[PDB]
Design a binder for this molecule. Sequence first.
Ligand SMILES: NC(=O)c1ccc[n+]([C@@H]2O[C@H](COP(=O)([O-])OP(=O)(O)OC[C@H]3O[C@@H](n4cnc5c(N)ncnc54)[C@H](O)[C@@H]3O)[C@@H](O)[C@H]2O)c1
Ligand SMILES: NC(=O)c1ccc[n+]([C@@H]2O[C@H](COP(=O)([O-])OP(=O)(O)OC[C@H]3O[C@@H](n4cnc5c(N)ncnc54)[C@H](O)[C@@H]3O)[C@@H](O)[C@H]2O)c1
Ligand SMILES: NC(=O)c1ccc[n+]([C@@H]2O[C@H](COP(=O)([O-])OP(=O)(O)OC[C@H]3O[C@@H](n4cnc5c(N)ncnc54)[C@H](O)[C@@H]3O)[C@@H](O)[C@H]2O)c1
Ligand SMILES: NC(=O)c1ccc[n+]([C@@H]2O[C@H](COP(=O)([O-])OP(=O)(O)OC[C@H]3O[C@@H](n4cnc5c(N)ncnc54)[C@H](O)[C@@H]3O)[C@@H](O)[C@H]2O)c1
Ligand SMILES: Nc1ncnc2c1ncn2[C@@H]1O[C@H](CO)[C@@H](O)[C@H]1O
Ligand SMILES: [K+]
Lengths: 458, 458, 459, 458
Amino acid sequence: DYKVADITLAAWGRRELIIAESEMPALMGLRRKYAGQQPLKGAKILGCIHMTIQTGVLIETLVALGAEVRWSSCNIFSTQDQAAAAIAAAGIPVFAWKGETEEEYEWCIEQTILKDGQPWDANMVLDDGGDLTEILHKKYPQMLERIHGITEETTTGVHRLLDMLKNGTLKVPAINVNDSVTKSKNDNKYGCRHSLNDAIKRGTDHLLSGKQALVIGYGDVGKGSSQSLRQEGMIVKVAEVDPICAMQACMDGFEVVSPYKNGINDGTEASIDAALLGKIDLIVTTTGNVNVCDANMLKALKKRAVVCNIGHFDNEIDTAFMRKNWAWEEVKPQVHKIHRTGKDGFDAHNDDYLILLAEGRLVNLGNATGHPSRIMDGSFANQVLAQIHLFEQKYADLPAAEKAKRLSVEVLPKKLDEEVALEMVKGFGGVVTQLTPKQAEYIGVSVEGPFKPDTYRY
Amino acid sequence: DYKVADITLAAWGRRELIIAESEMPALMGLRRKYAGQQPLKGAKILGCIHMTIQTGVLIETLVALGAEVRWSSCNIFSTQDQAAAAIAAAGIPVFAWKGETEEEYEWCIEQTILKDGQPWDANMVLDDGGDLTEILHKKYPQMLERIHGITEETTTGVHRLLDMLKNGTLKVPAINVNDSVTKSKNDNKYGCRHSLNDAIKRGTDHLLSGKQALVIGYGDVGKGSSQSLRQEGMIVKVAEVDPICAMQACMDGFEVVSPYKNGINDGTEASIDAALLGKIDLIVTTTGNVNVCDANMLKALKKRAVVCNIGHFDNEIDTAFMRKNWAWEEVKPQVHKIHRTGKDGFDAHNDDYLILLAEGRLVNLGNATGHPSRIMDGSFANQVLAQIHLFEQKYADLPAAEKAKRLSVEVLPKKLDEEVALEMVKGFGGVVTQLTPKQAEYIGVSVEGPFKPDTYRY
Amino acid sequence: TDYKVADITLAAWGRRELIIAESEMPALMGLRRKYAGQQPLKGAKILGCIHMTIQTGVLIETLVALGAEVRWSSCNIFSTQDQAAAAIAAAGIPVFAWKGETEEEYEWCIEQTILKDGQPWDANMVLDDGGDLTEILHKKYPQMLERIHGITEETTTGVHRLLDMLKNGTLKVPAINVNDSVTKSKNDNKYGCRHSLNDAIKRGTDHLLSGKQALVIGYGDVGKGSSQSLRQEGMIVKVAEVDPICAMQACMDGFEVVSPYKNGINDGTEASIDAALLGKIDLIVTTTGNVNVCDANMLKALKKRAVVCNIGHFDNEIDTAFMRKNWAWEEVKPQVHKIHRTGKDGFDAHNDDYLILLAEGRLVNLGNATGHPSRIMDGSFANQVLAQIHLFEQKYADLPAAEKAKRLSVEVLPKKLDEEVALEMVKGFGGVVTQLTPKQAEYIGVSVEGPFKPDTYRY
Amino acid sequence: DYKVADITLAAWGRRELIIAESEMPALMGLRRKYAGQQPLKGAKILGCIHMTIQTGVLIETLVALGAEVRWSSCNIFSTQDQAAAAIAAAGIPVFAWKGETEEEYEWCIEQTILKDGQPWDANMVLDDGGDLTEILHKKYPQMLERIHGITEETTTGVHRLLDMLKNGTLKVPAINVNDSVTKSKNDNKYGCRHSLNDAIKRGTDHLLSGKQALVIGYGDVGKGSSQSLRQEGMIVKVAEVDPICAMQACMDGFEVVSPYKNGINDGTEASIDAALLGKIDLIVTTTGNVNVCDANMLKALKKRAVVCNIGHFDNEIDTAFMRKNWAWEEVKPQVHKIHRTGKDGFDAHNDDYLILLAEGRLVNLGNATGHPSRIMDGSFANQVLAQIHLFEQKYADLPAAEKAKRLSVEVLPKKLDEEVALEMVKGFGGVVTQLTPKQAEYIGVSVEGPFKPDTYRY
Ligand SMILES: NC(=O)c1ccc[n+]([C@@H]2O[C@H](COP(=O)([O-])OP(=O)(O)OC[C@H]3O[C@@H](n4cnc5c(N)ncnc54)[C@H](O)[C@@H]3O)[C@@H](O)[C@H]2O)c1
Ligand SMILES: NC(=O)c1ccc[n+]([C@@H]2O[C@H](COP(=O)([O-])OP(=O)(O)OC[C@H]3O[C@@H](n4cnc5c(N)ncnc54)[C@H](O)[C@@H]3O)[C@@H](O)[C@H]2O)c1
Ligand SMILES: NC(=O)c1ccc[n+]([C@@H]2O[C@H](COP(=O)([O-])OP(=O)(O)OC[C@H]3O[C@@H](n4cnc5c(N)ncnc54)[C@H](O)[C@@H]3O)[C@@H](O)[C@H]2O)c1
Ligand SMILES: NC(=O)c1ccc[n+]([C@@H]2O[C@H](COP(=O)([O-])OP(=O)(O)OC[C@H]3O[C@@H](n4cnc5c(N)ncnc54)[C@H](O)[C@@H]3O)[C@@H](O)[C@H]2O)c1
Ligand SMILES: Nc1ncnc2c1ncn2[C@@H]1O[C@H](CO)[C@@H](O)[C@H]1O
Ligand SMILES: [K+]
């Protein structure tokens, strides 16, 4: 049976899916080339990726390889009704309705994995966040021995596998694709460069040329934010803590500045550089840290400045300071005014206030529609290629003598990653040059790949 | 005492070094921080690196902290007479010479070690070409027994050590620093981005906005090459063989094409894409390979075109095809004219002629100045710090029970590289922020660093 | 008092949009203070037809503050912002504008701007855009032009039509060409589209743009901003032009120039179109203001799934009439439609050969988005409100017949007022202007506080 | 006929005159687009503009259209014999060098107008700066009744021409070329975005990525300079006296600053803002006014900063307060080192000293070759056609009534300015669209042009 808020919405879902799947050369090429080869025949997969219409393309892809699947949603908010009814109409069971209370979802966490009222024989597992990785070890250990392997994509859940490997709890092998080149370049750096100024303009509608912005942190995401601001016409300052990253910011044309005098933070009103915070119009925070934009910074900020976060979650900006002594007023669904004059009794025509986007949380998913389709394609294409390599190995059928040595946490091989990238090149219409036999020997590389060492920094 | 051509030029040399010292913060900062401690007192070092004012500054800051050194040359050709005099008149022996001749290094090497016809007491080596390692191992076996360590800068020479470590021939620990972040990002990427268009606009004195350009290979050198050309105003095409690099090049705003139909390199003129080559005029070869540009692209290229090589040797462009049928003419110190008609019938008004910038060899070192001093500064401070890290161990004074555990090729630890980068960031006027304790345990990194793991790509 | 807008419920939302907006326009809000006790526009009457965005609210508020009487209506089919029009109506201005209109509705709304209780009210001034409002008053209802002091024109496509009437002698009242000021030509036409074009493209269809190819028709003042908007994102752009000088400038900025027809000559057959390049183009944009710059033989040769959009002022740029008679249309969302090629009256749900069209080929950045930002629109609106005062003083209809024929022409404002606007517009960003020593002014040849460039200077 | 020097010339530059003329699309394209018939058979012209390798091509172009102009050299520099001996070898007399009579080269002028003692018959004049134009009124007025018109190429000279028209002394109509739109944008803007940074690097070999700059003025030269510095990664600031140019600077991604507090200059040491000045690493002068470098900023400037000039007038930098009161040194044949120690007596180890790159003059002349060919080629093509247009009116051969009303000074018409833009577009390989008669009617323009009104500001 299916649990979708409404089923009649499938008519719109298919119309939406047909155009969207036209934008994804990688999954289409995977469908085209492995026609007849059917490497997924006889494989039954259990999956938990978030139910967006994007993943419907993948779900239709790998089944076109000859695989039967069962499905659910990992997060209680990451779902779409029109796609959910679409898969329900297709035939694959779904429980991706939006309960938004987390009590109905806790009642159905095991409803998805049970066939009817008992466990059953499943072959491969594809998860998101490791929530299902906990389940088959702790709830129903019996079906563990038949699992060939696990694919998971998250860097906060891979640590769980890493520190259960040492404890000897991990029963069947796992694979990680987050640390690969294509996913790391596409998800982190690009997309943000494409969506940050979309989010700022879709919500505020202000001009950006000729103004001043401060960006804290210069990682992969910090670079994507710095590029998206300059190309619109702003002048950008970077605050960094790692000396090596700060060296790149200077050589790319930025002013490295510290909002504390001499770079020391003493937690006092006099530790701040008041000549800097009183001149800047926009602040963007790009760290996975805590309290990088503290209380003393904002009191020195110029009036009418815009605050937005793209980092981890609601810790970089002291938003808890806001609800204690400053008032909040609403403009639109996710733009607010914070009034510095007092907790209540504020006035519309006031001069000292602040502009906040997405009330602290991530904005490029809040004040816009997020990553496009050409980008969330090679991230997905690598994962389905995890299944093929992991299914052929036949972990469960191995006898106990050699079974022990293949229980490991490894990285996605580089040769596989060169095949997702080849289809994006052909998706853009590009042509890749072939190596003559005499030529490839000089590099000391196979004609088909891989071309680069394991330590190479792309 | 000395083999410099003229001792008298030392005053002019010193005049040059005095100004050159102004543009190297990293070397200067070392002297301020480590005064009074005098870490290098008692050390005796040999050197072999090529000579200039820059390495003269490096030697002066080396001897400032208390070391005694002897010095020589690594490259046969490159010579800097006035700086060599400037040091030979400082009281430090230098044995460089002019003549550009190989037969005298039989005596040039032996004069580096022989103090008075006898082996001299040594503690470190600062070899560059790896030739001192060879003489050290194969000659004077009784003397190398007290050497603490070795620092090398080149990947083509660290291989000769990494292959011999498995064989047990290596007798002293070494450090490879070419894989350090500062060394890799400064040299490969930023120097060429600074000097490519300068070399072009000196050699040709043309204009570059609104023209057709092709860049073959998309490595770090080629990643920094196209940036220098897109700023001037060129429409630039990119060719590549590694799919992931091409997938980057598409996402940087370049069109990816190949000179062969569908990419298959048959060998006959029937396979050359005649339409694409017919409107390009500037070529910059990036790859370190063989015949990446064979005869049929130069036989089919547009009528007027200039050739630029930034690779490593004389194998990227078929320059030996030139010498047998297409004649040459000199117009300026290094710019040549190549007429695609024959070796007879030279004419002065011909339209079908091509242009080489450095007769096929690398053009940056031939037609221009090379890297600026500021970039070259940070390449040397790591070699400074490596000597300290090797001197702090006292490898030769450890018991023979433990000496068997130290013959290794390790990389430079991250902390030293961060300290080198900090002295740069203070040179531009940037200020690096300091972490409070309550933010340090959040990541899992101490307040002093290093902040990134070993596997991180910057 | 009376109004017909999409809704009144959205009155609050527009206001908060405006209070922020008022703080982004230093130059216009300056005149609201300088001429506070001095009220030059007392007893004036205006009827205007401009895009009803969030900026056009502040201009109405300004004119009301200086004592004007306003009856206003929108200018285009898809241009109004239904929260911005609600506030102006809610304040008391009779206004008639909504979204998704038709040519039947387009002409009705203007028809209420002139008529009141059926009676044509005595209008002293007109604020027109695109020449539409001019044409009715001249061809219809001649009684109005014998009591009109002046009219103000803002777009370059209506200026052409207005100088067209002078040569024929059918023009009755003088006008100020507000479009030729520097704070209008080189501030709005160039930078405005740079901020809004690639915004509007991304909100409508939402594709990644880095790494695709596009074609741009026209390298005028709008063309430059358009090309920069595309290039800064990652596109591989080409420009097509009929003017040699603008073509040379396009070559100098790092672009390549091509033409849709072989050798450049447009015979009219299918054998003149070059399908070599049209078969790899994912985007075409019209910036011409002319007719038939994208004809029927071009659309047939186009690569599948390509995108088309227009930023001129009319529908004549692309030959739409072929599409709506030969090919079937399907809607995927507002202002975006799908046209299935080779299908006269039907289409499969899995078809591969089709095209996509943004807002049916009308003004896309204003129909598929919210238009230019507030800060750029400060100079031109200041020029407009300033030009209202200059004509309102001469009292054209009160002059005698001898003095009547000496005031009939078209002109542009003097440079000093432009510089005064530019100063207050600069001061907002945080710049500091440096005054000249009494020796420096004499050396250069200008006054210390006077004009600094002659009128021939092009900037 | 040879009068500049010895022949001295066989292959000392004549070779690269070929690449020079091939570089220039329009000046050579007209040569064959208006060949076949020769409209200029009988135009006897004289005077000078320059004498370079790029200046000898115009004379040959005129001759190919049938003219027989007589030439000589002028202006500040006349050592460029690498092309002068070629012109003399072509059969027309020319004068470049002289007996060091830079104060008075009028003796050369007497050798040009005269043929056999009797003055040479002429009907047209081609002048640079007017020192030769006055001669046909002050010294030899009897020849002028044969003149059809004159051409002038200077911004100061047109002022004197308009003054002469205000007076009555004008006796021949004259045409102006500086108003050509293809000349205004090329020589002003495009010529300094290619040459400023190249010259800076050529004379200093410095790194600019990360340093901070100040540029005074935002005219057309300023617009070129700002792009030429920004594209290299510097942080650029802008200063201006025109509010409109400042407005334009605000929206191009630059910041507006003022060397004087509140912008009010009064000569006091208390009104200047030394804090801003103590951080600027470079100042470039772009105006044409007086005292943009007062003696006070040279006192408050940061140590070891760079000062540059690209303007025309030398009172921009207070050089008189520098060549007095302070000591000077020469680093290299074009760069100088000036000490702020005091009157005299300096040790070469100090921290306060500045640097001048051409000593107050234009840096694109001394430290660089200058405007490349493809920019200043657009300038000359306005000259041959200007001769063509004035030759078909026959000003002298009109009766008295027509001659009185034809004495008028006008710019070159718009129709001729697009016939030069066509030939430069066609050079890079582009194609220009042709309009249909139905389209031509709708706009209001004939299919042959001109296409835009005269008050249009491109
Ligand atoms: N919203 C999105 O679309 C999105 C996408 C990818 C990642 N993320 C999130 O981004 C976060 C980090 O980005 P990343 O993955 O590029 O990480 P990263 O580690 O590569 O970058 C973090 C940088 O911040 C610096 N930093 C740390 N503490 C700082 C401080 N107090 N002040 C200044 N700089 C400081 C670090 O030195 C480092 O350079 C993660 O939490 C990740 O979940 C969000
Ligand atoms: N001039 C300088 O300043 C300087 C500095 C550093 C290195 N180098 C030299 O540059 C050379 C190459 O640069 P790198 O070290 O960054 O290279 P790299 O190792 O980063 O990669 C070389 C690139 O060439 C591509 N490639 C290989 N064969 C190809 C072929 N036949 N056709 C097309 N592409 C092909 C590879 O895919 C790769 O992208 C080296 O040999 C090095 O010695 C020069
Ligand atoms: N949407 C907006 O914000 C906005 C703003 C101002 C003006 N406009 C509109 O822009 C249009 C004109 O733009 P402008 O102000 O830059 O005027 P413009 O005259 O400077 O530009 C028109 C350009 O089109 C070129 N052109 C004409 N026929 C052509 C052809 N067949 N092929 C190629 N190019 C051709 C002309 O040579 C000229 O360069 C008008 O329709 C006007 O209403 C829109
Ligand atoms: N070196 C060359 O190749 C070259 C070429 C052409 C012109 N020039 C010379 O360059 C100079 C300017 O060139 P242009 O015509 O592009 O400039 P411009 O005439 O267009 O503008 C010069 C600017 O100087 C500004 N200015 C004047 N006094 C000022 C002050 N005290 N502070 C700040 N700004 C001030 C003015 O506002 C003006 O914008 C002229 O002297 C001209 O002769 C040199
Ligand atoms: N937001 C806006 N509100 C009103 N008019 C606008 C806006 N954006 C652009 N315009 C003007 O609309 C006209 C379109 O032809 C141009 O004159 C342009 O300046
Ligand atoms: K808007």
